[PDB]
């Protein structure tokens, strides 16, 4: 799904089926929202953060 604010995002699926919308829930006790990261590609090989 794409609205954790309304839809439960407890994953009901696995086995790589259908791309997954991925967000970042904000950890701060005011407006904990989910910053949309991206549509998960079916394959991820390199990830990097800085």
């Amino acid at each position: 799904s794409s609205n954790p604010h309304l839809a439960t995002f407890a994953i009901p699926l696995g086995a790589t089926q259908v791309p997954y919308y991925c967000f970042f829930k904000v950890d701060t006790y005011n407006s904990t929202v989910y910053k949309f990261l991206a549509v998960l590609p079916p394959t991820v090989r390199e990830i990097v953060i800085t």
Binding site: S2, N3, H5, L6, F23, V33, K35, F36, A38, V39
Partner: peptide, 15 residues
């Protein structure tokens, strides 16, 4: 063709 921003639900596209 462009992967657009968040559906922006709640500048929020939806609210």
């Amino acid at each position: 063709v462009t992967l657009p921003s968040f559906n922006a639900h709640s500048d929020t596209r939806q609210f």
